[PDB]
Design a protein around this nucleic acid. Structure first.
Lengths: 92, 22, 98, 80, 94, 99, 78, 103, 92, 21
DNA sequence: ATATGTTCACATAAAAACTAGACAGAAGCATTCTCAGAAACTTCTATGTGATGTTTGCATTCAACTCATAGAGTTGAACATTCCTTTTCATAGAGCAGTTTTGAAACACTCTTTTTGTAGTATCTGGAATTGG
DNA sequence: CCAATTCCAGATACTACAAAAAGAGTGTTTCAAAACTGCTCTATGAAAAGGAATGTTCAACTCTATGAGTTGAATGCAAACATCACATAGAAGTTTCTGAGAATGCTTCTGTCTAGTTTTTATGTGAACATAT
């Protein structure tokens, strides 16, 4: 049994465009993109935690890795989104 | 031209990033 | 009885990202907010790409996105082109340049 | 022709150059293009065959090519 | 004539090299590396290899024509490709 | 006749030494100015080894870029360097190695 | 005017070590701008590395990590 | 009774084993992997040191300085290809002048 | 309280050149080189072990990573030295 | 152009950007 | 005629030799986990066929290129002089970094049950082709 | 060249279901705050000398229009092979199960790598003797 991100990509597509479809090769490309970005961020956070003699990966390492990896406005908006998500998840 | 997507992030088109400008 | 992705108000899965972080030997311990942060960032990037892809598809009287539209959306953006600088899209073509 | 390297004909090289934006080409370009393609293929195929024979298989898989391209610094998204 | 050809080719997205010659060349290069054993190939592997090779060649041609325009000519020369490979720096041009 | 080719001996002597070519105090001033322009209002301290490493890296980068730009100059059929050579060298090196 | 501290003879020495024989007058400002961009990128990365930890002093390892994260490795200050 | 002496090496085996065990690489580490790694590292170090010593001796010197390491690395195509994105501090450049400039 | 490879580099130098010294900066450069090569090889071996669904790093993974990372003759001689050291170590 | 302790020929990086027949 | 190559005192910042001593490495045994070996079966790869029509290969050519040269205009290297700016030898003050404890909060580990992505199956339709105006 | 018709491959829609993830509880561990110590960064003072700055000049460099020599994109026509439909055998990739060997966790004994001393030492600096350009 295989695993991919097809259902979530389709959900966000129906959110941003209600009357637009997508092919299968485009879905494969999106899966590859998600996997690549995941690997980049996770590796950067791991080496950051290793540099400072820590054994835990927290949202602070993720935020620092995002600031190090993404360009300016993308990084600002991604930091805002992550902070809002963590704040919403904490108050539950 | 540019494009103002949701969250008001101005999506600009690449230009001559190889030229020094003041 | 209640999903964590719905707790965070997201569409991407949180438990799957947490499991993938735990089984990737990145560190011996994993926090609680790291998967939420990562899923939020991934969903934001996905939506940002898909909006421009849908716009590029609509500007050609099409109702279905193909790799050409993804290539156009990625190469017609500054920061997106900077992020994916060493990536090749299959069946994407090139941008018309004189 | 008979040699396998001659199977890459001049029309295909011309089409690739025209897609790249080239307007006028010289006669000596085709052999240089064949040599460059040969070097590229040699590197990628060596890495892919190493990846394949590390496991105990006799068939080259698309994932081997993807891993070779990624370790050489060239990510491919379509065949993931 | 050339202008319409370029404008039409820059809009399509299909492969430009035939499948059988590419398959033959790849198989002979692969059999040159092993100890005489013949390996089987999947179709997706050959397709991915062809896609990567064609993208690489198109990008290299773009860079070489940039160099040609800098040199003051309109015809592409092999030394333009050589200089582009040299400037790319031992890892991207090779 | 004042000096036939002093640039030749100058290059031959400079390619043999391994010492830094930019003064330390102006480099430190410029680095501190940029760093204080990046941070909000705080003034950070600097170790001497950090400034030395930064200067070494910057000078190596500049020398390599000058080599590539002179390659492009000689390809263009000239012996005098122009800013367009540096620009084209950056463009061909790409987004990372060309800044 | 700290950018003017990088004088013309220093740029001349750098270009001569690089192998250049003749230099035009419009090159010094271009070199200053390129150096400024390089320093901005490296210093931004180093300051991020520094303030990730709860410190207020830039160290050599911060600069080394910032250089490594961009595809450039330095050996002398390890 | 040392492991490095048992394998006929100068580099340490226990240190490489500990670094592999505490490096976040895999859940388990074999027994011959540290020996293999130490042997490869010692071979590379010996090659570099021999080339640098030859450079220093031809330069009429007695001590190796970073200049000799740079001269040894940049004059070997395989070592130059291995260390292609590395900068050596206080190493300088190779005396390469274009033939078109020289008369 | 710091760790380095100074004594081993000095032993190798005495084996190669019995009448040659070395400075401190060159020793730091050698330490940096050793650490860099170690990190590269270990990371490649980890990736190889993860690709084939294994949880162990053996000498075979190290050999394959060495073949992948080093150029031709260096890789051949390194593999020779590695297998020689292994067969000498297992016979005691 | 140089034979080390082990018989590995250490060659100078002459040229790599030209296609050779 | 001058920087170049070679030669001798010296002392000195730098390399090198001793030491002792915490701490990292080695020896040995029971536990547990992993990867190799064996049998099958089913999917996918290699092989032959028919046509073939679709594309390519070969021969000319002349309009469109490249290349060498000389005159008009532009300018960067070479040089005298000066004084200002960077460098060197002391000098603390103290803001900031490094070391040690500990404990409360955060994270890992385990069994159960439900819910959600997956694999097949049955319908619906956007997109490509051809012909005609 | 665009517009309209029709066909079918390739989407969307629709279900069973099984395994993965919350729910809840329990045991482990780790990192920030506080106190203390030290350390090196920074701001200051007094000389000083050599390297940057101004100004001028002229031989060296670039730009550009032009004639002489080369060639490759367009065109017509005959050949031929990459493609495709169909079929088809069988090889090996994959799945399940089992079992022996290797890694591991723990403890005790050893030997050694490194920081603190403390003894030599290549070579940069200064000054001087032949010399190729």
């Amino acid at each position: 049994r295989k695993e991919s991100y097809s259902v979530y990509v389709y959900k966000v597509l129906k959110q941003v465009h209600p009357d637009t479809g997508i092919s299968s090769k485009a879905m494969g490309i999106m899966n590859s993109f998600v996997n690549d970005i995941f690997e980049r961020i996770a590796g950067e956070a791991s080496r950051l935690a290793h540099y400072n003699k820590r054994s835990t990966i927290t949202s602070r390492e993720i935020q620092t890795a995002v600031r190090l990896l993404l360009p300016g406005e993308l990084a600002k908006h991604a930091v805002s989104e992550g902070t809002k998500a963590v704040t919403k998840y904490t108050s539950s | 031209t540019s494009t103002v997507t949701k969250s008001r992030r101005i999506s600009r088109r690449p230009s001559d990033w190889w030229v020094v400008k003041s | 009885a209640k999903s964590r992705s719905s707790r965070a108000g997201l569409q991407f899965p949180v438990g799957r990202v947490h499991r993938l972080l735990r089984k990737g030997n990145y560190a011996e311990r994993v926090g609680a907010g790291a998967p939420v942060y990562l899923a939020a960032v991934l969903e934001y990037l996905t939506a940002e790409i898909l909006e421009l892809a849908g716009n590029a598809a609509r500007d050609n009287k099409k109702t279905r996105i193909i790799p050409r539209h993804l290539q156009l959306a990625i190469r017609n953006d500054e920061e997106l082109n900077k992020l994916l600088g060493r990536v090749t899209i299959a069946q994407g073509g090139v941008l018309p340049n004189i | 022709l008979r040699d396998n390297i001659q199977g890459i004909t001049k029309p295909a090289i011309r089409r690739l150059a025209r897609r790249g934006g080239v307007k006028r080409i010289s006669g000596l370009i085709y052999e240089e293009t064949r040599g460059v393609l040969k070097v590229f293929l040699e590197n990628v195929i060596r890495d892919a065959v190493t990846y394949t024979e590390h496991a105990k298989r006799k068939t080259v898989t698309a994932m081997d090519v993807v891993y070779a391209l990624k370790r050489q610094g060239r990510t491919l998204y379509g065949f993931g | 004539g050339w202008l319409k050809e370029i404008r039409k080719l820059q809009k399509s997205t299909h492969l430009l090299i035939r499948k059988l010659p590419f398959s033959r060349l790849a198989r002979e290069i692969c059999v040159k590396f092993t100890r005489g054993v013949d390996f089987n190939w999947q179709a997706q592997a050959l397709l991915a290899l062809q896609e990567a090779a064609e993208a690489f060649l198109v990008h290299l041609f773009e860079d070489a024509y940039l160099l040609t325009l800098h040199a003051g000519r309109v015809t592409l020369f092999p030394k333009d490709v050589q200089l582009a490979r040299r400037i790319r720096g031992l890892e991207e041009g090779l």
